[PDB]
Amino acid sequence: KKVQTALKASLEFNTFYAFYESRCPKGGLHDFQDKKCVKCGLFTYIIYDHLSQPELVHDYYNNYKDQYDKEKMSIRSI
């Protein structure tokens, strides 16, 4: 049960951050003037590790989830 729950959460986060790694939620591609993107609040050290600083992984995920949801079902339609 715990394996299934943790795997579902991990897979959701991995898919979200593998989508928004070059994709910018504010359109186009990311603009890294630092570890942090300029158009968004994406840090470079969050894309691949979602466990060291989970709060910074739960903030970005919370910011661009609804749109992520609309985009996700837009490809999978028609």
């Binding site: 490809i75 999978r76 339609s77 028609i78």
Partner: protein, 105 residues
Amino acid sequence: MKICKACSSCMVRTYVDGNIIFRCSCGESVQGDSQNLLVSSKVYHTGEMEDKYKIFIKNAPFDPTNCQIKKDCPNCHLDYLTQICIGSQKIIILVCRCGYMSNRG
């Protein structure tokens, strides 16, 4: 195309002073009003559109060579569905013999 009202030929399209004039080889000339303002067209991804698979999706529950899935149909409450995968985006559609279609079709 435009069809001549007398010889039923395909009239040739010419453009003059913001007007489209159809000239036939029989001498008949006509003016198009609205339905003739389409010079050319092209649609893309023709092998993956919805109109390409309409008959196939309609026939899918009856073809015995299609993949079946263990899922309840929300309409007739049959306990299996037909799963089809179309296109290069691998769109999954579940269809049932009753007429149910995921993607709301």
